[PDB]
Amino acid sequence: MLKIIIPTTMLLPMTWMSKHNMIWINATVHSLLISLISLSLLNQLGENSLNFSLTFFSDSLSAPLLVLTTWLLPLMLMASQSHLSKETTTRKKLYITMLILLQLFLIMTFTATELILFYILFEATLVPTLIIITRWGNQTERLNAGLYFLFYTLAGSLPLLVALVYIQNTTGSLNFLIIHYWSHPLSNSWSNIFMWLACIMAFMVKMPLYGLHLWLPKAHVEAPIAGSMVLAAVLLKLGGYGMMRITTILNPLTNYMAYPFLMLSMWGMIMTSSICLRQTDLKSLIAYSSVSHMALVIVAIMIQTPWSFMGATALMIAHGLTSSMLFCLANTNYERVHSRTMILARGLQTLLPLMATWWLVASLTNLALPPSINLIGELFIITASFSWSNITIILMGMNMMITALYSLYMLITTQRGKYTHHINNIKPSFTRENALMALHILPLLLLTLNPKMILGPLY
Amino acid sequence: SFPKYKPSRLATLPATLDPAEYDISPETRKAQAERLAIRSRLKREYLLQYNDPNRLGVIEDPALIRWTYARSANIYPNFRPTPKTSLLGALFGIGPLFFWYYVFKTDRDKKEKLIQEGKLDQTFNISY
Amino acid sequence: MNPFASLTLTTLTILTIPIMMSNSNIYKTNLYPNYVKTTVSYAFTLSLVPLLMFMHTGQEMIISNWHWMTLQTVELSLSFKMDYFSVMFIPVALFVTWSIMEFSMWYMHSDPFINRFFKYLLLFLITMMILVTANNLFQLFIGWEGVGIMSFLLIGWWHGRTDANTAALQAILYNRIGDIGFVLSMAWFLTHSNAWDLQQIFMLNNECPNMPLIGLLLAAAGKSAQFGLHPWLPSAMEGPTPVSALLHSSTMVVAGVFLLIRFYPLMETNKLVQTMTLCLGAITTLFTALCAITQNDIKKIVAFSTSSQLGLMMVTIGINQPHLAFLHICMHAFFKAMLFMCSGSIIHSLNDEQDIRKMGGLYKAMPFTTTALIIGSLALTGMPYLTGFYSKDLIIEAVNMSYTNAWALLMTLIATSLTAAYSTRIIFFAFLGKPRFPPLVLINENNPLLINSIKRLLIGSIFAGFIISNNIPPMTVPNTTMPLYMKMTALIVTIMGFMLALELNNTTYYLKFKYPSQTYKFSNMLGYYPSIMHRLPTYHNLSMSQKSASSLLDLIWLETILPKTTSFIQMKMSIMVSNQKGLIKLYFLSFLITIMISMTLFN
Amino acid sequence: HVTKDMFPGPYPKTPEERAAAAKKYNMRVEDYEPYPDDGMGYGDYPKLPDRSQQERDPWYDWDHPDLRLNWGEPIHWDLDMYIRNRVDTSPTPVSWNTMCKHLFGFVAFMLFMFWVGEIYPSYQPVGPKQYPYNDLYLERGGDPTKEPEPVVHYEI
Amino acid sequence: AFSAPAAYLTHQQKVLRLYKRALRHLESWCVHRDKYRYFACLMRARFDEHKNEKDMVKATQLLRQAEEEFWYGQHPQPYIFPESPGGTSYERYECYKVPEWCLDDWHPSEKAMYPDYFAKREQWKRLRRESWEREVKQLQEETPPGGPRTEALPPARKEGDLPPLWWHIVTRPRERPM
Ligand SMILES: CCCCCCCCCCCCCCCCCC(=O)OC[C@H](COP(=O)([O-])OCC(O)COP(=O)([O-])OC[C@@H](COC(=O)CCCCCCCCCCCCCCCCC)OC(=O)CCCCCCCCCCCCCCCCC)OC(=O)CCCCCCCCCCCCCCCCC
Ligand SMILES: CCCCCCCCCCCCCCCCC[C@@H](O)O[C@H](CO[C@H](O)CCCCCCCCCCCCCCC)COP(=O)(O)OCC[N+](C)(C)C
C-alpha cells in the first residue's frame, strides 16, 4: 500500500520546491499519475482481502473509495485554479498542501486494519477541511459553518473512542480480521444498548442522518469549490464505510436498535427531497439532495442484507461523482455571476449550449436514469427494503418522483426560459471547465459497463 | 341577473368583478398616482443603470437580496416559541415518525409470526 | 446460419450509426436529415425479412448475447425476445417513422436546429425498439425511461416558451407516478420468482398474486395515459407536430398496453386485475371521447382521440384478448399517424393556426389533405374492409359476447358513438364551410415530401388490415354465431353518432344564440380535472415544503434542540462561573465551606 | 452594496418603525402590511397579495418578461411557488366549488355504476366451454401420477 | 406594450375594453361570419342605447351588470391569436433571441468573417458612447424634482441629439431571428 502512500507524501516537497508559475501543472500531472497507480487496487478476490501488511489492507469495499479519492484531487486542483489567481505563491502552496494532506489522511483511513488507527485518521481528516473552509471561504458565515462542521462531528466521535478502548479491553484486539473471525452476539442489555449507540452515532452524524444534518448545508454552501467537492464526494462516505465495518460486532442488537434510525431515514428522505422543491440557493439544493441520497444509504446499511450492501456501495460511488459534478457546474455559474441565487441567471442554454448539455447529463444522472450506476444502487436498495417490508415501496416510490421533480426544476430554472437582460458578462466557457465536466462524467458512464467493480465485497 | 361567481384561494376574483374599482374617491386616485410615481422612479433608476455603455456587470437588485435573506437567514432571530409553533412542530416532526414506526412494526410482527408458524410459502425466495 | 437472429439484431444495430456520425462532418451539413431518413427506410426494408420468415413458419427466438453481471444466483444479461410481437411491431414503427421523417423534412425546414431534431427522433426510435424487444425487466425499464426522457426533450423543444417546459415536466411527473408501480413489480418478481427474465417469471407464476399485476397495471396506466393519469397526453401537444404524430399518437403511448400484453400469461390467471383493467379502460375511453367532443384545437381533438383509442385497447386487454389489442395497436399506428400529418399540413398551410374556428373551406382548396383525412376518419370509425375494421369491429364483437360488466360495455358503445361524433366535428369545421382564415391565402400542398409521406400511410391505412389479418395465424376462438342485431351494433352506433353530430353541427348556421349549459362547460374544461388536480395538490405540496419541512423543522426546531440549547446553556454557565468580583473575602469563605464539606461528606 | 439597515428586520411594533419598513420595501405605508406577529419568523417582511404571476399583465413591459417582475419591486414571500411553471390562482369561468362538486359527482357516479355492473354482469345464453381430456388436466399443471376424477362432457 | 401606462383607466377606456372583449367572445361563440356580423350589429345596438347618458352613478351601475353578464357567458375557450399571450406560439421564438453584446465575445477568426457588419457595429458603438453622455444630462434637467411621475420618456430636442435611453429599444433582437 506504500506504493500509493509514498508518492502522495512526495507531492508536498514537489509542491513546495516548484516554480511560482508551475505549481498547478506539476500537481495535476503527478496526482493523475498517482490515480493511475491506485487503479491497480481494483484487482480483488472473492476470498478474504488484499492484506498487504499488519497495518494496511484493501477490500473491494475499500478499492473503489480509494480510486475515487485519488481521482478527485486533480479535479479539485482544476476547479481551484480559477478563483485563486490573485493569491500569493505561499498561500497557493498552502492550499495545495491542505488538499494533499486530506488525500493522505483519506487514503490511510480506508486501508487501515485497526479500528483505533481508523479513528485517528478519520478525525485527522477534520483539520485540513476546517482550515480550507474557514480560510479560503468567501462569506462571513464560513466561521460559523466551520464551528458546526467541527462540533457535531466531535460530539459524535468522542463516545466512539471510549467504546473502542472498552472493546479492546474485553476482546483483546481491535484488528478487523480478528474482530470478524471472533465475533460474538450482543445480548439485549442497557450496557449493550449504550455501546451500540456509541459505536453507531459517530458514523450517523457524518452521513448525515436526518435530524443531525444541520451542519452539512452550512458547510457545503460556505466552503470553496474544492472543499465542497471533497466534502460531498468522499467525506460523507466515511460514515458509510465505518458503519459497514462496525456492524459485524453489533448483532443481533441491530435487529431492533435500527428502528429509530430507519424511520428517521425513510421519512427523512421525503422531507429533504421536498426541501429541494423550495430552495433559492443552488448549493443548498445540491446539499439537501446529498442528504436524501445518504438517507437511502443509511437504510441500506441498517437492513444488513447482501443486496443492501451492494446497493449502498454502488450508490456511494455514484453519488460522489454526481454531486461533485453538480457543485462544479454551480460554481462555474457563480464565478460569472457572483450571486449563487437560482433565479438570477436564467436561459443559459442560449448563451452556453455545451454547458447546458453538461447540466442535462448531470441532472439525468442525479435523477437515476437507467442504466446508470445511480439507478443500480437505488434499485438494489429498494429491492432489499421491499424484502424487509413490502410497505417501504410507498415511501421509496414517493422519493423517486420527488427527486426527478427537483432535478428537472434545477435544470429548467437556470437553463431554459429567457435570458436575464442586464447580465452582459457571461463569457464563453473555458476549456478548463469543459474538461472538468468531461472528466467528471466519463468515468460514470464507463463504470456502468463493469458494475461489479463498485458492488462491494458481497458481489 | 345571472348566477354569481364565488372566488376561492386558487381561483381569485376578477378585477372586473371588484366593487373596489367602482368605489372611486379622491384618496383612491391619490394612492394610485403615488403608486405609479414610485413605480416610475424605480423604472427610471433601472433603465439608467441598464442603458449605460460603461457598465459591464450584473445589476444588483436590493429586493432580490431582501427576498433571499428573509427566506433563509432572518427566520430564526424572529422565531418565538408559541403554543401554535410548539404544537405544529411537535405534530409535523414527531407524529409521522411514530405513525410509520407503528405501521412497519405491525407489518414485521405479522410477518415474523407467520414465519414462525411456518405458513408463509417462501418457495424460490433465494435473494434478499 | 438461421439469418433470423442476424437480421433482427442488424436492424437495431444499423439504427444507431447516424447517432455515431452525429459528431462527424455530415451533422454540420444540410444532408443529415436525409441521411437519417434513408437509414430508417433501409432498416424498415431489412426488418421486413424476419417478418416474412415468421409468417412462413412461425419463427421465434431468444438472443442472450452479452452477460452483464451476476448477483449470486441472479444472472443479468443483454437478451432480446424476437417473438410475434417484436417482429410485427418493428416494421410498423419503422414505416411510420420513415413517413414522419419525410414529413418533418418539409415541416421543419426553417428550424435552425433541424439536425438536432432529427437526431432526437432517431434516439427516441432506438429507445422504443429497446423497450419493445427487451426480454428481462431491467432492459425493459431502460427503454421505458429512455422514451420518457426523449418525450421530455421533444415536448420542450422550444425551451424559451414557459408552457412547453411546464408540459414536459407534467409528462415526467405522471410517468414517474407510473414508474412507482414498475419498480414495485420488479421488486416483487426479484423477491419471489428470483428472476427478471421473462421465461422464469412465466414458469414460476402459475397463479399470479395481486401485487405484481397491480404494479404492472399502474405502470401501464401511467404510460398510456389512463383516466387517473390522463391529462399529460393532451398537454404534450406543446411539441412540434411531427413529435405529436410520432411519440404521443401511435408509437410511444402504446407502451403501457404493450407491457400488459407482454405479461398476458400471468394476467389471464387473475380475475380481479382483469376487471380493474376493464373498468379503467372503459372509463378512460368514455371520458376522453366526451372531452374531445367539444374541443376547438385540432391537435387536442386528435390527442383525445388517441387517449380514447388507448382506453379501448385496455378494454380489449381486460376481456382477455391480448392479440386483438396488439392488432389494434398496429392499425391505429397507421391511421392516427396519417391523421396527425394531415392536421400538421393544415396548420402549416394556414400560417401556424391551429383553431378550427379559423379554417373554413379546405375541401377544394387543398384536396389531397382532404381525401387523406376523410380516409383516415373512415378508418378510425371502423368503416368495413378498411384498416380499422379488422381490429375495432372484432373488439366490439368480443366485448358484446363476454361475461363482463354491463356498465363497461355500455361505456364502450357510447365511446364508439362519440368517436364518430368528433370525427364529424373535425371534418365539418375544417373542410365544409366557407373560408374563415385571413385574406392573404398562402395555401400550398405541392411539395413531394409531404405528398409521398402522406400517401404511403394512406395506402397503409387502406390495405394493411386485410394483409396483416390474412397473414397471421389464428390466436383465439372466433365468434362465429351471433344475433343479427348484436353483429351490427358497432355499425349502428357509429351511424347514430355520425347522424347526431351532423344534425347538431348543422344548427350552428341558425341565427340564434344562447349561453352554454352545464354539461357543455363540463365537457369543454375536461371535467375540471386539470384545474382542481393541478392547483390543489401542487399548492398543498409546495406550501408544506416551505412551511413545515424547511422553515419549522429544519430552520427552527432542529436548530433549537441540539445546537442552540447547547450554546445557551454553556454561555449561561460561563457567565455564572466567571462573574466573580475578585474579593478574597468570598473566595476564602467558599474555601472554608468546601473544607467543611470534604471533612463531613467523604468520610 | 446593500447596507446593514437595508435588510429585513424584526416585526414593526410602532408606527415610526412601520413607516421606516415601508420605505425600505419601496411601498406606501398605507399599503405596507407585515405578517401577523406569530411564532414563525416572517418578521419585518411584507405580506403581499396571494395572486400568482400568471395573472399579472402580459402586455406590460416588465424588466423580467418571463417572470413578469420589475426591478426593485417587493417580491412575494412565495414567488417560487407562483412562477407560471407551478400553481396559479387565476380566475376561472366556473366557480371552484361548482367544479369540485361536478368532478366529484362524476367520479362517484362512475364508481357506483361500475360496482352495480359488477353485481349485474352481462353474458350470453350459453353453458360453459367444454374441453376434452378431463378438462385438459395433463396440459394444465399436470401431476400425471394422481389419476384425477374423470369429468365427462354431455353431447346433446 | 410600447405605450406607457397611466395611473388608472377612465370610464370610457373601461367601456371600450368591455366592448372589444364582448365582441371577441361573441365571435368565438358565433363561428360563421354572417352570424357574427348579425349578432355584432345587435351588440353594437345594445351598447350605444346608453351612449348619451349623462350621470356617472348609473353609468357605473351599467358596466357592472355588463361585466357580470360577460363573466357568466364568456366562452371558456375563446379564440386567441397564435402570437398572443395565450396563443399556441406565444414564446415559440424566444429561444432564438440572442443579445447583441454576445458578438463582443466572438473569436477574431469568427469576426474575420463579416468584416463590413463589424465595422458598422463599431460605428454604432461610438454613436452610443457619445449620445449617452448627452442623454444623461438631458434626462437630468428634463425631470421634475422629486422623481418621475410617469414612466414616459422625452424625445430629442436638439439637432445632433438622440432620444434618451434608445439603445436597448433600437437594438431589439428581432421578431423571428432564426
Ligand atoms: C338502449 C337503447 C339504444 C338507443 C338509445 C337512443 C339512441 C340515441 C338517442 C339520443 C339521446 C341523446 C343524444 C344527444 C346527445 C346530447 C346532445 C345535446 O343536446 O347537447 C346540447 C345540450 C346543451 O348544449 P349547449 O349548451 O347548447 O352547447 C353550446 C353549443 O352547442 C356548443 O356547440 P359546439 O359546436 O361547441 O360542439 C357541439 C358538441 C357540444 O355538445 C356538448 O356539450 C356535449 C354534451 C352532450 C353529449 C354527451 C353524451 C355522452 C353521454 C355519456 C354519459 C355517461 C355518464 C356520465 C354521468 C355524469 C354524472 C354527473 O356537441 C356534439 O359534438 C355532439 C354531441 C353528441 C352527439 C353524437 C353522439 C350522441 C349519441 C351517443 C349517446 C347515445 C347512443 C349510444 C350508443 C350505444 C347504445 C346505447 O347538451 C345537454 O343539454 C346535455 C344532454 C344530455 C346530458 C346528460 C347529463 C346530465 C347530468 C346532470 C346530473 C343528473 C343527476 C346526477 C346525480 C349524480 C349523483 C352522484
Ligand atoms: C435529535 C435528532 C435525531 C438524533 C438520533 C436519534 C436516534 C437515537 C434513539 C435511541 C434508540 C432507542 C434507545 C433505547 C431502545 C431500547 C428499547 C426500549 O427503549 O424500549 C422499551 C424500554 O422501556 C422504556 O423505554 C424504558 C426506558 C424509558 C426512559 C428512556 C427515555 C425515553 C425517551 C427519551 C428520548 C431522548 C433522546 C435524546 C436525548 C438528548 C422496551 O421495554 P423493556 O423490555 O423493559 O427493555 C428492553 C431493554 N432491556 C432488555 C435492556 C431491558
Ligand SMILES: CCCCCCCC/C=C\CCCCCCCC(=O)O[C@H](COC(=O)CCCCCCC/C=C/CCCCCCCC)COP(=O)(O)OCCN
Ligand atoms: C451528535 C451528538 C451525538 C452524541 C453522542 C450520542 C451517543 C451516546 C452514547 C452513550 C455515551 C456513552 C457510551 C459508553 C461507551 C461504551 C462502553 C460501554 O458500553 O460500557 C458499558 C457502560 O455503559 C454506560 O455506562 C453508559 C451510561 C451512559 C452515561 C453517559 C450518558 C450520555 C447520554 C445518554 C443519552 C443519550 C444517548 C443517545 C443520544 C442520541 C443522539 C442525541 C458497560 O459498562 P460496565 O459497567 O463495565 O458493564 C456492565 C456490567 N458490570
